[PDB]
């Protein structure tokens, strides 16, 4: 058995996992088969190992969180974990172990081993004490821009033979903020990116957040719009509105329809010196969104064009404090 869980222990097999989130994998190390009639000599001679072929393209292991315990949570000492970048890179003894076990791995993997086979056998195997490996791995923050599926595979090795656990699959959503320029709050209004904005005119920067898909694995703690605008051409008026981009289902079962004004569920911080405005969703509002609901929102910053020339703007949508830059717009005055 292998399962993936979020930090609060919720099973998240098959779920969408945001860049920066952690997969708290739990691998079951089943020692039940030793209640059979093979000898301790056969068990100890072969040793006790577990292999995790983790998806190194998507995930970074958190070795500081790797732990081995029994089913009651008693921590188990004497199990070591070694990470290897590839099979070729691993020592001959490890290569041979996997070969004999009928295992192949893709790229990097981890090997868990009983440091002291005889004592492992006496204290854990012979007492019918199965173990639980906690093996957390974080989605690379970068990956959130390309997105894609990843798969974690594990194998237990007993009497020198490897047996696969289940494979757990997850997906990383591509988070792709977009920035438009408008003179209206209507979502169908014309995008002025690439066009002219007259001197002294009021206009909006439309900051469309990334789409958090339904069936996501972690609470939303942060969903912010950060806009360091060019003060040589633009002045933020101190007025903005934020709207839902989609229907949102809340944990209680209520629904906020697409296009609802969510400005009262946000706060804004403005830096007048540097020409930066940051609009954040209130944490208590984000907590109300169901994990099964998609989430997306957009913010219209009301601006004034205060000088002639060509000016660009880009914004950053942070999602659980991970930054995703929008496209860069350009207007001429
Ligand atoms: Ca791998
Ligand atoms: Ca600025
Ligand atoms: Mg070598």
In words, what does this structure look like?
It contains 4 helices and 24 strands. The protein has 333 residues and is mainly beta. The protein folds into 2 domains: 1-175, Immunoglobulin-like (Sandwich); 176-333, Immunoglobulin-like. Strands 3, 6, 7, 9, 10 and 11 form a 6-stranded antiparallel sheet that branches. Strands 1, 2, 4, 5 and 8 form a 5-stranded antiparallel sheet that branches. It has a 5-stranded antiparallel sheet with strand order 18-19-14-22-23. Strand 16 (248-249) and strand 17 (255-256) form a beta hairpin. Ca(2+) 4 binds at residues 228-229, 231, 274-275.
Keywords:
monomer, 333 residues, mainly beta, Immunoglobulin-like, 2 domains, five-stranded antiparallel sheet, 24 strands, 9% helix, 40% strand, binds calcium ion, binds magnesium ion, cell adhesion, cell wall, antigen I/II
In short:
By secondary structure, this protein is mostly beta strands.
CATH architectural category of the largest domain: Sandwich
Beta-strand proportion: 35-45%
By DSSP (H or I, 4+ residues per run), the number of helices equals: 4
The unique ligands bound to this protein are: calcium ion, magnesium ion
Binding site for Ca(2+) 4: 228-229, 231, 274-275
Cross-link (Isoaspartyl lysine isopeptide (Lys-Asn)): 179-313
GO cellular component, one term: extracellular region
Binding site for Ca(2+) 2: 30, 32-33
Question: How are the secondary structure elements laid out?
Answer:
Layout lengths: L1 E2 L18 E8 L10 H7 L2 E5 L5 E3 L5 E4 L8 E6 L7 H9 L8 E6 L2 H9 L5 E9 L8 E11 L2 E4 L3 E5 L5 E5 L19 E7 L14 E6 L5 E11 L3 E2 L5 E2 L9 E6 L4 E6 L1 H4 L10 E9 L4 E4 L2 E4 L2 E4 L3 E4 L1
Antiparallel strand pairs: 1-2, 2-8, 3-7, 3-9, 4-8, 5-8, 6-7, 9-10, 9-11, 12-13, 13-20, 14-19, 14-22, 15-20, 16-17, 18-19, 21-24, 22-23
Bound molecules: calcium ion (2 copies) and magnesium ion.
The site of one calcium ion has 7 residues, from loops.
Protein name: Agglutinin receptor
Family: Belongs to the antigen I/II family.
Subcellular location: Secreted, Cell wall
């Amino acid at each position: 058995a292998m399962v993936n869980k979020n930090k609060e222990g919720l099973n998240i097999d098959g779920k969408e996992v945001l860049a920066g989130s952690t997969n708290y994998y739990e691998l079951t190390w089943d020692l039940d088969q030793y209640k059979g009639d093979k000898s301790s000599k056969e068990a100890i001679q072969n040793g006790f190992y577990y292999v995790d072929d983790y998806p190194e393209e998507a995930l970074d292991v958190r070795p500081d969180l790797v732990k081995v315990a029994d089913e009651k949570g008693n921590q188990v000492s004497g199990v070591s974990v070694q990470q290897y970048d590839s099979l070729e890179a691993a020592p001959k003894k490890v290569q041979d172990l996997l070969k004999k076990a009928n295992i192949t791995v893709k790229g990097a993997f981890q090997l868990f081993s009983a440091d002291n086979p005889e004592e492992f056998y006496k204290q854990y195997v012979a007492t019918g004490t199965s173990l639980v490996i906690t093996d957390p791995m974080t989605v690379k923050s970068e990956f959130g821009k390309t997105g894609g599926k990843y798969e974690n595979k594990a194998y237990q090795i007993d009497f020198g033979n490897g047996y696969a656990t289940e494979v757990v699959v997850n997906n990383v959503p591509k988070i792709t903020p977009k920035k438009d320029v408008t003179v209206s709050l209507d979502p169908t209004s014309e995008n002025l990116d690439g066009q002219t904005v007259q001197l002294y005119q009021t206009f909006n920067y439309r900051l469309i957040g990334g789409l958090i898909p339904q069936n996501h694995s972690e609470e939303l703690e942060d969903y912010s719009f950060v806009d360091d605008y060019d003060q040589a051409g633009d002045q933020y008026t101190g007025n903005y509105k934020t709207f839902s981009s989609l229907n949102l289902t809340m944990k209680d079962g209520s629904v906020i329809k697409a296009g609802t004004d969510l400005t009262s569920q946000t706060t804004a911080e403005t830096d007048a010196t540097n020409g930066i405005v940051t609009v954040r969703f209130k944490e208590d509002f984000l907590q109300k969104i169901s994990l099964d609901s998609p989430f997306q929102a957009e913010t219209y910053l009301q601006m004034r064009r205060i000088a002639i020339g060509t000016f660009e703007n880009t914004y950053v949508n942070t999602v659980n404090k991970v930054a995703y830059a929008s496209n860069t717009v350009r207007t001429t005055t």
